[PDB]
Amino acid sequence: FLQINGYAVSRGFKDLELDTPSIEKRFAYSFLQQLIRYVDEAHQYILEFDGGSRGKGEHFPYEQEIKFFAKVVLPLIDQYFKNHRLYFLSAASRPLCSGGHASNKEKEMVTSLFCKLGVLVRHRISLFGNDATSIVNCLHILGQTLDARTVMKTGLESVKSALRAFLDNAAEDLEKTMENLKQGQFTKGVTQIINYTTVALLPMLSSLFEHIGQHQFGEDLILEDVQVSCYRILTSLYALGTSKSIYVERQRSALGECLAAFAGAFPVAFLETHLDKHNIYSIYNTKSSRERAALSLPTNVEDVCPNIPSLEKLMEEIVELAESGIRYTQMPHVMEVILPMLCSYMSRWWEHGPENNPERAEMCCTALNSEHMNTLLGNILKIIYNNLGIDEGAWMKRLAVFSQPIINKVKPQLLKTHFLPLMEKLKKKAATVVSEE
Incomplete structure (x- = not known):
């Protein structure tokens, strides 16, 4: 009857203002500040608890709080950043075409949370109550969710410094692992830091490097003095991988899988150092000689990584060991x-290789011919063929998984009649675990 008489009734109140532009209203916003405050709280609690931890009084006035952290906050962070992993990475590159581009503030708080979790987890795996696996999983997925390009182009200075200090600490701990394991084979602070490295530092760095390499964030994250930090990391991880020690034999494969990730993450052709002048991203070009001398830098691009052989050399000892056919046990390091x-490295640098882009030839960062990759994979074939004979191993799975990018870049016509032998050798040695493709 109101409508029939024509009277107009309406809502009791019309909103004075909708604050849609306000990013603070986003759920992830407040969730991230709550998580950041909780993580900083837990960090400072463990700071005053470093004294009581060496005492018998494990029950400490906020034992309930430290239990709440480990039992709730870490698992919820893990599940949340697994469920909304693609949400944070979508930054003006159109992932998740449904919509929902994450805020730059949210991205930088994600990076800050990553850094704070890393600082909390440094040298504390045994101190924390057997939840270090949960923490490393959380810091793993946060590493995959980091948006380096955006957090570096438009990010807060403290956050950027936190990420740089994270990289510096990750370099320093592994340098110390060298110092101790080379000076003394016998291994309790040294044992604690070695265990911390093996348990946490290698998988987390490997995951971060893999994410950076796959999303091409190495062209923006690592430009100045983080180049130097990762120079230490490279010259370090190579040394651990090639070192002879029964102590390092056990955790060795983690070093090898981290080195592969770093080789694809790192934006400078360290192996072919002679043509590093062409790389605009090289610290030797951007930093200038004065700042290079000011920093702890060798001032020689060829001498920045002395122990690491050049790509050419590495190539001929690979081919000669392929001809020799030494089994996996004789020279595992290589x-x-x-x-x-x-x-x-070659999967990372082929698109910069000269044959892919005819122009700017002989101004290329690296000469990385498809002939070079075909020869490498032929040598990999030859060594594996020598390998099917003597009692085999579990490492063929990792070798094939690492070499499959090469077989994908290999042309199908060169695949035919050249890698068909690999399958026929698979069949005629039926009792072999070699996993083709």
Whole structure:
């Protein structure tokens, strides 16, 4: 009857203002500040608890709080950043075409949370109550969710410094692992830091490097003095991988899988150092000689990584060991560390290789011919053929998984009649675990 008489009734109140532009209203916004405050709280609690932890009084006035953290906050962070992983990475490159581009503030708080979790987890795996696996999983997925390009082009200075200090600490700990394991084979602070490295530092760095390499964030994250930090990291991980020690034999494969990730993440052709002048991203070009001398830098691009052989040299000892046919036990270092390194490095640098882009030839960062990759994979074939004979191993799975990018870049016509032998050798040695493709 109101409508029939024509009277107009309406809502009791019309909103004075909708604050849609306000990013603070986003759920992830407040969720991230709550998580950041909780993580900083837990960090400072463990700071005053570093004293009581060496005492018998494990029950400490916020034992309930430290239990709440480990039992709730970490698992919820893990599940949340697994469920909304693609949400944070979508930054003006059109992932998740449904919509929902994450805020730059949210991205930088994600990076800050990553850094704070890393600082909390440094040298504390045994101190924390057997939840270090949960923490490393959380820091793993956060590493995959980091948006380096955006957080570096438009990010807060403290966050950028936190990421740089994270990289510096990750370099320093592994340098210390060298110092101790080379000076003394016998291994309790040294044992604690070695265990921390093996348990956490290698997988987390490997995951971060893999994410950076696959999303091409190495062209923006690592430009100044982080180049120097990762120079230390490279000259370090190579040394651990090639070192002879029964102590490092056990955790060795982690070093090899981290080196492969770093080789694809790192934006400078360290193996072919002679043509590093062409790389605009090289610290030797951007930093200038004065700042290079000011920093702890060798001032020689060829001498920045002395122990690491050049790509050419590495190539001929690979081919000669392929001809020699030494089994996996004789020279493991090369055969499950350098080979993944070579495969990942060349998969990373082929698109910059001269044959892909005819123009700007002889101004290329690296000459990385498809002939070079075909020869590498032929040598990998030859060594594996020598390998099917003597009692085999579990490492063929990792070798094939690391070498499959190479077989994908290999042309199908060169695949035919050349890698068909690999399958026929698979069949006629039926009792072999070699996994083709």
